[PDB]
mmCIF file of C-alpha atoms and ligand atoms in Angstrom:
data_model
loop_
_atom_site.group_PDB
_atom_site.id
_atom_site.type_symbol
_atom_site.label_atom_id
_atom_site.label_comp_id
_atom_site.label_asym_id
_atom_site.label_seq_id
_atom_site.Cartn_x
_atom_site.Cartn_y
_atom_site.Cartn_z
ATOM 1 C CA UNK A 1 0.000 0.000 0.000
ATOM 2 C CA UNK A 2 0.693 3.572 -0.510
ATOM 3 C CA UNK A 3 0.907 6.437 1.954
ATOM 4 C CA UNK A 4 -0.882 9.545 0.423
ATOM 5 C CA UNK A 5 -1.666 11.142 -2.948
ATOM 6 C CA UNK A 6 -2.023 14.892 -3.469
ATOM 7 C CA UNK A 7 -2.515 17.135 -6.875
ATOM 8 C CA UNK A 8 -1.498 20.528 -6.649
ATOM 9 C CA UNK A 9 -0.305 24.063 -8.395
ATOM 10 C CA UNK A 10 3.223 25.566 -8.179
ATOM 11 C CA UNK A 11 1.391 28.036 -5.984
ATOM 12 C CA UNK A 12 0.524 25.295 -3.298
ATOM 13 C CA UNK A 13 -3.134 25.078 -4.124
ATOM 14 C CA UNK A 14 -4.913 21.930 -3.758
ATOM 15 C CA UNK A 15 -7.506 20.255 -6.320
ATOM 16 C CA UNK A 16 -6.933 16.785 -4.389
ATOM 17 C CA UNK A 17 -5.704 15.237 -1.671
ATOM 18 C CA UNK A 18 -6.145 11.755 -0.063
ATOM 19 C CA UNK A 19 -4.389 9.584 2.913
ATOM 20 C CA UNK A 20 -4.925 5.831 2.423
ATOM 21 C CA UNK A 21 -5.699 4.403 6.049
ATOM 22 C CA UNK A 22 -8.434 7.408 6.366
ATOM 23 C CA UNK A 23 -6.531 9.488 8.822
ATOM 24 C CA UNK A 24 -6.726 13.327 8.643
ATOM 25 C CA UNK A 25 -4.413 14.293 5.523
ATOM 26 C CA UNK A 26 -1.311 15.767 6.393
ATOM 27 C CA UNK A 27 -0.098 18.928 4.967
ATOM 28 C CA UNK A 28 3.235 18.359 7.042
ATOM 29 C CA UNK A 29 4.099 15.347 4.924
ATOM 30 C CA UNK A 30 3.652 16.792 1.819
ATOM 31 C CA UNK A 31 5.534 20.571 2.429
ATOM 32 C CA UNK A 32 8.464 18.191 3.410
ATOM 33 C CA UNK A 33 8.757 17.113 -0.279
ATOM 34 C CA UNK A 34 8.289 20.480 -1.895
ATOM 35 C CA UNK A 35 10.595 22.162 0.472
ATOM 36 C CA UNK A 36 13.629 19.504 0.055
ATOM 37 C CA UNK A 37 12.656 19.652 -4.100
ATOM 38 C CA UNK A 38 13.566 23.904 -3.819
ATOM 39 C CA UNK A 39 16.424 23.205 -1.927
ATOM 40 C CA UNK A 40 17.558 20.105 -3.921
ATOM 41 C CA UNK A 41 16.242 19.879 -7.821
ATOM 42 C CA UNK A 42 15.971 17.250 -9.778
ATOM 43 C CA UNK A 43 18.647 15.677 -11.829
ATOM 44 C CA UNK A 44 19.502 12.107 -13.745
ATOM 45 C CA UNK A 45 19.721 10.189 -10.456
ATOM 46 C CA UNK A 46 16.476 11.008 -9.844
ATOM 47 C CA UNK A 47 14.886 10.174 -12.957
ATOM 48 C CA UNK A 48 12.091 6.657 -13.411
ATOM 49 C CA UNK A 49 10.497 6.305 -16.446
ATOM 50 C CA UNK A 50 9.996 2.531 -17.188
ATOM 51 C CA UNK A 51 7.096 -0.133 -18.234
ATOM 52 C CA UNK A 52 5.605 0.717 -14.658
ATOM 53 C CA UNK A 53 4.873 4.180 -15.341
ATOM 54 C CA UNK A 54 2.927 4.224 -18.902
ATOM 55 C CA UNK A 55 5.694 6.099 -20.613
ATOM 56 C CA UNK A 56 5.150 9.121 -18.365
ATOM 57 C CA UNK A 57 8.494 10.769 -16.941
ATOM 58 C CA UNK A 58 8.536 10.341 -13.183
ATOM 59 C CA UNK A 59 10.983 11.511 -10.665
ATOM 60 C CA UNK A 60 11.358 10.133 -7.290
ATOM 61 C CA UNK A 61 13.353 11.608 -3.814
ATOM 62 C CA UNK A 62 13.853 10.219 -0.324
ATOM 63 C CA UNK A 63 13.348 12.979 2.073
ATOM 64 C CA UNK A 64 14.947 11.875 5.615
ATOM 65 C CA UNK A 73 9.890 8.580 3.025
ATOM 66 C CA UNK A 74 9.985 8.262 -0.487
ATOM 67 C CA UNK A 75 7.878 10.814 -2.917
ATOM 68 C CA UNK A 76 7.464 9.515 -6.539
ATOM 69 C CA UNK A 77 5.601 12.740 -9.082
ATOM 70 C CA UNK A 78 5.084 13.605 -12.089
ATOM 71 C CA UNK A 79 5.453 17.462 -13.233
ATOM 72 C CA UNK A 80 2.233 18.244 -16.170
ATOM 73 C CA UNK A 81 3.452 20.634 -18.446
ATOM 74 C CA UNK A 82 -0.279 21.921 -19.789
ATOM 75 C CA UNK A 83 -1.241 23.658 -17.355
ATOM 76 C CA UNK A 84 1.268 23.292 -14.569
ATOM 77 C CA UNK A 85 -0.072 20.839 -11.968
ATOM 78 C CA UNK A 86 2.284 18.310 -9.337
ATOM 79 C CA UNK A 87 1.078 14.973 -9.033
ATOM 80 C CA UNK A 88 2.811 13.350 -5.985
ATOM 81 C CA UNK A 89 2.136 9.421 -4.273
ATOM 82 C CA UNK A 90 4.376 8.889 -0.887
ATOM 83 C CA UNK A 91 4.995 5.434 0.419
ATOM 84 C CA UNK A 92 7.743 3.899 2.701
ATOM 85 C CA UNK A 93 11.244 2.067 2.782
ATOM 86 C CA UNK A 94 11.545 1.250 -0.880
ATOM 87 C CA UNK A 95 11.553 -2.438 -1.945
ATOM 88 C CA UNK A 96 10.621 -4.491 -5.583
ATOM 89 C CA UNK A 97 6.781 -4.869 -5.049
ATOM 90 C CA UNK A 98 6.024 -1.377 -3.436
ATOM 91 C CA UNK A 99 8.745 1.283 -6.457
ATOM 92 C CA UNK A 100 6.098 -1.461 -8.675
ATOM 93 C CA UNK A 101 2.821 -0.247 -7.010
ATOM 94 C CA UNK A 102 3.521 2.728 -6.672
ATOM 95 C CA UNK A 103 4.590 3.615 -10.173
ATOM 96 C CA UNK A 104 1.623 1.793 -11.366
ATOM 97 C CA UNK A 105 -0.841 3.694 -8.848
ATOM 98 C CA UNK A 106 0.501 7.311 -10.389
ATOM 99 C CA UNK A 107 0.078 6.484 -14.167
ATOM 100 C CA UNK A 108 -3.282 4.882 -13.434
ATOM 101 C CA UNK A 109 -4.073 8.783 -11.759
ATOM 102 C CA UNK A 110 -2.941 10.237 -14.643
ATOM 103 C CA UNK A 111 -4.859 8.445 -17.121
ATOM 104 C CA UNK A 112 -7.868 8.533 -15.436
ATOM 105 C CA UNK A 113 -7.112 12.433 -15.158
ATOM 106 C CA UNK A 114 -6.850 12.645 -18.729
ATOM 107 C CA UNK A 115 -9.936 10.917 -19.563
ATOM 108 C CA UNK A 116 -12.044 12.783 -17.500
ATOM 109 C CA UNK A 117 -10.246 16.156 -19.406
ATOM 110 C CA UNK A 118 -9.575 17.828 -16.375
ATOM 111 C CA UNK A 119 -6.358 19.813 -17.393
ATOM 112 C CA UNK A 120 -7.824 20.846 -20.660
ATOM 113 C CA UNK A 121 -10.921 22.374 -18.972
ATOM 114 C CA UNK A 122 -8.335 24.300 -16.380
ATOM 115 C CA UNK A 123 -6.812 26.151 -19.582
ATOM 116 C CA UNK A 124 -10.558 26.726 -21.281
ATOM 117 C CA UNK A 125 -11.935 28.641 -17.901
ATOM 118 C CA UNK A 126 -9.065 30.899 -18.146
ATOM 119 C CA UNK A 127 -9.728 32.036 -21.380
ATOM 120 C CA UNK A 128 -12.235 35.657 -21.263
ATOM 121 C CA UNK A 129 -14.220 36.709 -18.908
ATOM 122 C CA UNK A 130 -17.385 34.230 -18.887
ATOM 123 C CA UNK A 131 -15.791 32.134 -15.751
ATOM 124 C CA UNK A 132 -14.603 34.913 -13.513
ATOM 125 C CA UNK A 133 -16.619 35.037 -10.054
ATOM 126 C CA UNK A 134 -17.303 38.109 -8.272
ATOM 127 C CA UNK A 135 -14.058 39.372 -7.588
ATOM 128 C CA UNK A 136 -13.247 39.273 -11.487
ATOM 129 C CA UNK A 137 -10.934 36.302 -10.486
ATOM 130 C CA UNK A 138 -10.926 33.211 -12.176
ATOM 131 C CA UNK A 139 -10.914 30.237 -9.408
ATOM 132 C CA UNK A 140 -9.013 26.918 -10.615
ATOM 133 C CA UNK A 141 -11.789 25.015 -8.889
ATOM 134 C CA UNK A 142 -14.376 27.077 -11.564
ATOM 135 C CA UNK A 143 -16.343 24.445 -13.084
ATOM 136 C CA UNK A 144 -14.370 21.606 -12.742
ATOM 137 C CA UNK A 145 -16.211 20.844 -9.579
ATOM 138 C CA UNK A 146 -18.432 17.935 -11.104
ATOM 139 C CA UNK A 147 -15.432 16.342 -13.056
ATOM 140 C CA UNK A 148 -13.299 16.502 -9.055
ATOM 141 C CA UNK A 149 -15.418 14.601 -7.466
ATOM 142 C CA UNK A 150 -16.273 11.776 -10.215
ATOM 143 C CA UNK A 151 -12.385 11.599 -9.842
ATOM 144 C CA UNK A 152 -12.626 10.906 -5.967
ATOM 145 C CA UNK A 153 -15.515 8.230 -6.870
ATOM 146 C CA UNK A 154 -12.821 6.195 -8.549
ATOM 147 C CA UNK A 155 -11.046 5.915 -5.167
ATOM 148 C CA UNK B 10 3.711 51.601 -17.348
ATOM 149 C CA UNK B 11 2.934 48.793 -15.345
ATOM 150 C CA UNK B 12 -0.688 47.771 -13.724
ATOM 151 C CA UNK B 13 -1.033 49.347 -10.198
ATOM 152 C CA UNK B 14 -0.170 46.322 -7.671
ATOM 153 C CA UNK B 15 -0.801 45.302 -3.862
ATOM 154 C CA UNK B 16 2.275 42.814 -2.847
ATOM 155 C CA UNK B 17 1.415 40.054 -0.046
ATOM 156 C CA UNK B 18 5.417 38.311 1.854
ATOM 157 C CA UNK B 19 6.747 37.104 4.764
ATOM 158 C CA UNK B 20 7.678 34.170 6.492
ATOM 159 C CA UNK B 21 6.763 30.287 4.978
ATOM 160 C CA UNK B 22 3.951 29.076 7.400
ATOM 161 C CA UNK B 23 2.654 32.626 7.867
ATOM 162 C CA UNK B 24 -0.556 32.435 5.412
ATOM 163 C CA UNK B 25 -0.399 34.099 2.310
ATOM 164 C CA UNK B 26 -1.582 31.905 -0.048
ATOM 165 C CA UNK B 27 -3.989 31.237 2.552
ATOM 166 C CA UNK B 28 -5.147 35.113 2.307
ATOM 167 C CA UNK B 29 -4.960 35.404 -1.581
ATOM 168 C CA UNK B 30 -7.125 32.413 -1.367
ATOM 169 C CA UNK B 31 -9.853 33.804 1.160
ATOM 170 C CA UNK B 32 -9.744 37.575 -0.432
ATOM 171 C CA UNK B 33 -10.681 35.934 -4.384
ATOM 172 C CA UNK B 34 -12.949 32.724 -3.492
ATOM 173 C CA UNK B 35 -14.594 33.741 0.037
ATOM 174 C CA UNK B 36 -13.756 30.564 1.145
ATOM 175 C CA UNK B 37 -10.930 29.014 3.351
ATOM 176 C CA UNK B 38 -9.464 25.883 1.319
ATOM 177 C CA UNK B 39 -6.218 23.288 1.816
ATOM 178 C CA UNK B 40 -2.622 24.813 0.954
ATOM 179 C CA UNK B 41 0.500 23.757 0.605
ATOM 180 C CA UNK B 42 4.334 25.208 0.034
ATOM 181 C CA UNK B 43 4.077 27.344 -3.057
ATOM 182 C CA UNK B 44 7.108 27.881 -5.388
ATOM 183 C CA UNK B 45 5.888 30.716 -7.466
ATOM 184 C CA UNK B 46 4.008 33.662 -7.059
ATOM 185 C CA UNK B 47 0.105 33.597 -7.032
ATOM 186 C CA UNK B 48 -1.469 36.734 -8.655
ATOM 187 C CA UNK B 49 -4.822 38.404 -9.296
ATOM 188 C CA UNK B 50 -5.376 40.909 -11.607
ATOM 189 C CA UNK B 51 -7.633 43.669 -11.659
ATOM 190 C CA UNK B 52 -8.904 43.132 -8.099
ATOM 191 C CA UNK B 53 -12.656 43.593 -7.816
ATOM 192 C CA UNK B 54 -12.475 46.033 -10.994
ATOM 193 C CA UNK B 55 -10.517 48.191 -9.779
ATOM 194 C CA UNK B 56 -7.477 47.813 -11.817
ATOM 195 C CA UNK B 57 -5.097 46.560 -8.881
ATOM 196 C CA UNK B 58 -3.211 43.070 -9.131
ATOM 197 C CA UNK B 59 -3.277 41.131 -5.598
ATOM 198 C CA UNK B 60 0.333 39.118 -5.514
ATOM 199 C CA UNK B 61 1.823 36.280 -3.280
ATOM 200 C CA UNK B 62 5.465 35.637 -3.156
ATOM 201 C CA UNK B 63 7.025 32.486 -2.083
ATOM 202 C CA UNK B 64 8.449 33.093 1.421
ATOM 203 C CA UNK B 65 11.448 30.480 1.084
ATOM 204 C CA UNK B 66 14.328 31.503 1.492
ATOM 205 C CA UNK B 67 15.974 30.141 -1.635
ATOM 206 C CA UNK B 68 13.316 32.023 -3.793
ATOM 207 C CA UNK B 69 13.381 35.441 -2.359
ATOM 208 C CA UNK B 70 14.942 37.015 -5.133
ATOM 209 C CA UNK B 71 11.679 36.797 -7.014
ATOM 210 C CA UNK B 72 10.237 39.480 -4.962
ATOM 211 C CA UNK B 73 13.511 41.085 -4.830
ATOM 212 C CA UNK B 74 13.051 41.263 -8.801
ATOM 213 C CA UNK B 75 9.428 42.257 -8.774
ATOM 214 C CA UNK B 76 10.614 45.728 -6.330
ATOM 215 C CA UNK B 77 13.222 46.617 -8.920
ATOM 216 C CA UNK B 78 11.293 46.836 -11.918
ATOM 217 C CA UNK B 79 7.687 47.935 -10.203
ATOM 218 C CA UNK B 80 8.149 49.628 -7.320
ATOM 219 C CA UNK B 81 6.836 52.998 -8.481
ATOM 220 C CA UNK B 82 3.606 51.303 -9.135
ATOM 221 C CA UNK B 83 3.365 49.731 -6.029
ATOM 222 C CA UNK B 84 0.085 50.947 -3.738
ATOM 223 C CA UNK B 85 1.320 48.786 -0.821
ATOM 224 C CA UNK B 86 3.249 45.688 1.246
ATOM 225 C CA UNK B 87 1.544 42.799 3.639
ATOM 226 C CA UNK B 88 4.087 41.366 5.461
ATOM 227 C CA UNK B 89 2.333 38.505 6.959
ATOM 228 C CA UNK B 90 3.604 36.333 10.362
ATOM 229 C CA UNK B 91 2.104 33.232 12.438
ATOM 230 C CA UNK B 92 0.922 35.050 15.671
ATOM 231 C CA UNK B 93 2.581 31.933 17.620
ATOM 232 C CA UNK B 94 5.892 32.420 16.860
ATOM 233 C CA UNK B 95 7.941 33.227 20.167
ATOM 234 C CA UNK B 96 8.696 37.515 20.135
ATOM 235 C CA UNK B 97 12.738 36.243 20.985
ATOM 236 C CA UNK B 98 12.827 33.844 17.977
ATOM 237 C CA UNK B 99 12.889 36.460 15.407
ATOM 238 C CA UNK B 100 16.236 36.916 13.668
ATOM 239 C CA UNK B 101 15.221 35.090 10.474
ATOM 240 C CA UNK B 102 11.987 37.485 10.007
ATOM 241 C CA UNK B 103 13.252 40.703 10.732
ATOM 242 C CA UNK B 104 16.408 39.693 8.406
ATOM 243 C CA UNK B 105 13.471 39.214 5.586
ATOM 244 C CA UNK B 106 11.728 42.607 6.579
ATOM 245 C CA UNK B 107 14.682 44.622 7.051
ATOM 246 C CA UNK B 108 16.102 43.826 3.374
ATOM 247 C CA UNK B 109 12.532 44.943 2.065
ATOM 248 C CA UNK B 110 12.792 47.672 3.752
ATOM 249 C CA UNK B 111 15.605 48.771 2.076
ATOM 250 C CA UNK B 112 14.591 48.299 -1.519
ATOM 251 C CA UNK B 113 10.683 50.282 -0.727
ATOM 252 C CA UNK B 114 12.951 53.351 1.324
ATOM 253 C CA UNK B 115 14.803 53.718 -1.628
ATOM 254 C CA UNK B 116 13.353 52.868 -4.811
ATOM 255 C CA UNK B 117 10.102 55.581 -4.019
ATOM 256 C CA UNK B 118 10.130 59.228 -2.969
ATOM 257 C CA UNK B 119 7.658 58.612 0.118
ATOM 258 C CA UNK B 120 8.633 54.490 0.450
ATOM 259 C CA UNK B 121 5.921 52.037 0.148
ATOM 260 C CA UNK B 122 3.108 51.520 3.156
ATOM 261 C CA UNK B 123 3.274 48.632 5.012
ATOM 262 C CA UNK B 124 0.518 46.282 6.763
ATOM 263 C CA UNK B 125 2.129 43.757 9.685
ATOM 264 C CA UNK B 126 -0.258 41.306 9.829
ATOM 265 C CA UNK B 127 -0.450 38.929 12.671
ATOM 266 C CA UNK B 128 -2.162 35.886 11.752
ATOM 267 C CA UNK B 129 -3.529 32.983 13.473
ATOM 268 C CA UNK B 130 -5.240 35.369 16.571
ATOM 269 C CA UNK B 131 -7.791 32.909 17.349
ATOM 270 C CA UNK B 132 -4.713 30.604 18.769
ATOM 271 C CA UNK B 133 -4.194 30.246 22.822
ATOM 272 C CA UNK B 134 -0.361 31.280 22.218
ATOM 273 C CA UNK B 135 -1.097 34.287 19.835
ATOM 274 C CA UNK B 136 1.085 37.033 20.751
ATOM 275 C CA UNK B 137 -0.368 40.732 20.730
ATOM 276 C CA UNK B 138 0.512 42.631 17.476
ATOM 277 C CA UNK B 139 1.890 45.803 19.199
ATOM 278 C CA UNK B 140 4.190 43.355 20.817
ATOM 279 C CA UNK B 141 5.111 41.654 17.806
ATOM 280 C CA UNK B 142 5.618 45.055 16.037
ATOM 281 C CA UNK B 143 7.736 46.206 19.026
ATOM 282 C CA UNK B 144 10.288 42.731 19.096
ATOM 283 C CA UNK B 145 10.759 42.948 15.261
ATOM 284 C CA UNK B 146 11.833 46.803 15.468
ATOM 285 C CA UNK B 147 13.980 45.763 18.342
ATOM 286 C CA UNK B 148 15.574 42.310 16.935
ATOM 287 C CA UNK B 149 16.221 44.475 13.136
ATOM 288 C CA UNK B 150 18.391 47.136 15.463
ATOM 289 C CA UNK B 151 20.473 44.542 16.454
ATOM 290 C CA UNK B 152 20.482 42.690 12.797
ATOM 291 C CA UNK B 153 21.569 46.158 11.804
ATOM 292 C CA UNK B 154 24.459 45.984 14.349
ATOM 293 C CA UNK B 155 25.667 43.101 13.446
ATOM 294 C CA UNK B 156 26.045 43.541 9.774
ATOM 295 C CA UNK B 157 27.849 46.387 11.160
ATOM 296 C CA UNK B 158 30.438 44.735 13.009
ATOM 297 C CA UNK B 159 31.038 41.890 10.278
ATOM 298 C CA UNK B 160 31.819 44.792 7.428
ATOM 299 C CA UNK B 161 34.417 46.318 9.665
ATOM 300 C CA UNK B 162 36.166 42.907 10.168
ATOM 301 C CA UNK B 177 21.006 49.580 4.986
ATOM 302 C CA UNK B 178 22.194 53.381 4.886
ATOM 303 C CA UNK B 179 18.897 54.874 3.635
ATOM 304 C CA UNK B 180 17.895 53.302 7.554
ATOM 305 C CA UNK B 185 18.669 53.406 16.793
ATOM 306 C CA UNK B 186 16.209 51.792 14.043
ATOM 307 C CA UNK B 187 12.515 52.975 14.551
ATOM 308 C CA UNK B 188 9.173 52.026 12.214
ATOM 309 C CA UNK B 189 8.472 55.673 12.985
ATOM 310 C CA UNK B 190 11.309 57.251 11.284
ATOM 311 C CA UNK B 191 10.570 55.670 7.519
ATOM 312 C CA UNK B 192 9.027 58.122 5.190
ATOM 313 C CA UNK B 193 6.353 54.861 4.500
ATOM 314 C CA UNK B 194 3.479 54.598 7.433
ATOM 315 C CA UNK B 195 4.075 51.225 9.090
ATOM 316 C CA UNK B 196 0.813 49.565 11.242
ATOM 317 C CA UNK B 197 0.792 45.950 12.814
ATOM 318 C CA UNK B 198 -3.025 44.648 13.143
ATOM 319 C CA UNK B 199 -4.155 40.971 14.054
ATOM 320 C CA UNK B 200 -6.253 38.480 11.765
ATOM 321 C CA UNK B 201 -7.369 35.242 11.817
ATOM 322 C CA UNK B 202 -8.359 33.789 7.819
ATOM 323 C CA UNK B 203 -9.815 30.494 9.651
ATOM 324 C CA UNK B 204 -12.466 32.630 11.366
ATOM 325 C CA UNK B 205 -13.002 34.734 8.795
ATOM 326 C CA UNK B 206 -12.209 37.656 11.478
ATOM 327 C CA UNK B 207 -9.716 40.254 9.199
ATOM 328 C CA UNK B 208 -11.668 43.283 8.785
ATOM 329 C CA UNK B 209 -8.918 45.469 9.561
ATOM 330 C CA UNK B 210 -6.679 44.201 7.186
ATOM 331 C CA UNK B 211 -9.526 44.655 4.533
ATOM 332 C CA UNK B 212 -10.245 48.054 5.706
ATOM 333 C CA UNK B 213 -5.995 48.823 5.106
ATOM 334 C CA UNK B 214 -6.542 47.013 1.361
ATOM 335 C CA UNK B 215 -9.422 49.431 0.803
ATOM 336 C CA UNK B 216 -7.687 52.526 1.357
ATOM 337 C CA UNK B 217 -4.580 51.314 -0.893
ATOM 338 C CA UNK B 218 -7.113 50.435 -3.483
HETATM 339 N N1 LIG C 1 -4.654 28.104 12.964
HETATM 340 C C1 LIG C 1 -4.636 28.784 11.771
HETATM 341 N N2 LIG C 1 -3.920 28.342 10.735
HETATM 342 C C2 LIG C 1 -3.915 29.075 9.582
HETATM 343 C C3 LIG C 1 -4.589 30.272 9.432
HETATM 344 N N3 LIG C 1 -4.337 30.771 8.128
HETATM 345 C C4 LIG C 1 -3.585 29.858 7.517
HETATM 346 N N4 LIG C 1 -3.317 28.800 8.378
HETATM 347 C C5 LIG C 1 -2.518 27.618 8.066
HETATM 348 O O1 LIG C 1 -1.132 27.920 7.988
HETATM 349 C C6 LIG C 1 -0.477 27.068 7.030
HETATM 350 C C7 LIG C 1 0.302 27.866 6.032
HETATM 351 O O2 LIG C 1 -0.567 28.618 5.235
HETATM 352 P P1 LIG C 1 -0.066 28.988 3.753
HETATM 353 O O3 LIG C 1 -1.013 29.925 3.226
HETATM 354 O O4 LIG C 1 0.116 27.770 2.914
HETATM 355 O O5 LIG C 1 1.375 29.631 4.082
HETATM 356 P P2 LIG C 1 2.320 30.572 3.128
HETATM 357 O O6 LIG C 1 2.601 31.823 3.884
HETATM 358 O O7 LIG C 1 1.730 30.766 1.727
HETATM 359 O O8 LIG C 1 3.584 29.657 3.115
HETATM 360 P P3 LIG C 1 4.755 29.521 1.793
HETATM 361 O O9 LIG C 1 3.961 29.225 0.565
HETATM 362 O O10 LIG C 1 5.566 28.395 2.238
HETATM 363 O O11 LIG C 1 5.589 30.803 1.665
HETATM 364 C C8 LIG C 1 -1.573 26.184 6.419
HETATM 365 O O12 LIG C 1 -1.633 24.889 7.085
HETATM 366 C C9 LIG C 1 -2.827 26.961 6.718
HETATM 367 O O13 LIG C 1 -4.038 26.145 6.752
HETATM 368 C C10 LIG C 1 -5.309 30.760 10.514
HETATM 369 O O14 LIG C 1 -5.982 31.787 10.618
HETATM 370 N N5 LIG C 1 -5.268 29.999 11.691
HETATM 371 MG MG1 LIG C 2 2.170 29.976 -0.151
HETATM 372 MG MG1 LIG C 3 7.342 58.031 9.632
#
């Protein structure tokens, strides 16, 4: 089993987060990963892209647990699953686990609506702001009912 | 010409992306670390861009950047803390607000206005915000000092808020209570 799964922006906004044994999520967890990534980016070593992952580019750290993600290009969205000491069976889950998120993101055209809504003036709220959560709501949480 | 803009750093932990969040969506939602800024143009229609810098240390030259080509079009500064944080723990934050501080002096006639706001006042250990205000003017004298000392081995700035050319005011908050009027009242003035 995995530990958590989160999808946010480089701004730290979350459009998902969720902590397999039901526990309250943990924020902590997470901010350890992104604040070791600024301090230490990515290079060869850290590279995985195999059979396991679909053909996606992953990278994978070991912050002193393990966090393997995958950087989207279109729009700009982290994708990050954290899990324990690394053997065989769980780098294999794992890496299967994110590409299965990914594809079932990208079925369910979730990034390409995030680029539409920014586009004019028809999804800005009252503030004149467009929201990233604007009307992908109903998309989110079919997403969560595949979990 | 650049867009008139409000500018929202300080500390990681403190709530800024927290704030940007509450002030667009009038909702309080999960965050996490953010490494790059979060912006908002044209404010409520009223032309102004609402920005949120990274507080990291290892990305602080992106506000840094930001002063240097904008800061004649800037209306005002939020330089946001955690409440909690012990008053004689505060090297690393005045550090941050003293090298602002420097840049907004200098880069503008009149410097740039500045909001201290002390988040997180619905917390037991929330410290009062003139007390707050009063340890960081104290613990940036003695950053001052020391940078000093090290050069004989900040000249536009004892140190006093009071003796800027910018008005500097330190007012609680709480975003998880929805309970920041005053800082809302400060944005509508800069506006
Ligand atoms: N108790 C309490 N916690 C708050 C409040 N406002 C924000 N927080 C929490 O403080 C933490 C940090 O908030 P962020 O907005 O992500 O912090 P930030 O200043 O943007 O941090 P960086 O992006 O790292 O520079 C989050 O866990 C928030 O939920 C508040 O009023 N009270
Ligand atoms: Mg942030
Ligand atoms: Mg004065």
């Amino acid at each position: 089993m995995f530990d958590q799964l989160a999808v946010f922006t480089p701004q730290g906004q979350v459009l998902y987060q969720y902590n397999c044994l039901g526990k309250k999520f943990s924020e902590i967890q997470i901010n350890s990963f992104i604040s070791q990534l600024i301090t230490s980016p990515v290079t060869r070593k850290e590279s995985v892209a195999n059979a396991n992952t679909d053909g996606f580019d992953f990278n994978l750290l070991t912050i002193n647990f393990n966090a393997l993600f995958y950087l989207n290009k279109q729009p700009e969205l982290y994708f990050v699953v954290t899990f324990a000491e690394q053997t065989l069976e769980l780098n294999q889950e794992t890496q299967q686990t994110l590409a299965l998120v990914l594809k079932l993101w990208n079925s369910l055209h979730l990034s390409e609506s995030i680029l539409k809504n920014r586009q004019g003036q028809n999804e800005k709220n009252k503030h004149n702001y467009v929201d990233i959560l604007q009307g992908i709501e109903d998309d989110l949480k079919k997403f969560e009912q595949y979990f | 010409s650049y867009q008139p803009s409000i500018i929202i750093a300080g500390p990681q932990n403190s709530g800024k992306t927290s704030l940007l969040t509450l002030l667009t969506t009038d909702s309080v939602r999960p965050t996490v670390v953010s490494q790059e800024p979060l912006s908002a143009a044209d404010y409520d229609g009223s032309g102004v861009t609402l920005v949120d810098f990274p507080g990291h240390v290892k990305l602080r030259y992106k506000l840094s950047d930001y002063l240097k080509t904008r800061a004649k079009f800037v209306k005002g500064l939020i330089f946001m803390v955690d409440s909690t944080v012990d008053p004689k723990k505060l090297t690393t934050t005045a550090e941050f607000l003293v090298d602002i501080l420097s840049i907004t002096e200098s880069s503008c006639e009149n410097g740039i206005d500045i909001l201290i706001a002390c988040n997180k006042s619905e917390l037991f250990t929330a410290r009062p915000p003139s007390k707050i205000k009063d340890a960081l003017e104290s613990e940036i004298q003695k950053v001052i000092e020391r940078r000093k000392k090290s050069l004989n081995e900040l000249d536009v700035l004892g140190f006093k808020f009071a003796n800027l050319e910018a008005s500097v005011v330190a007012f609680e908050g709480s975003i998880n209570k929805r309970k920041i009027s005053q800082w809302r009242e400060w944005i509508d003035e800069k506006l």
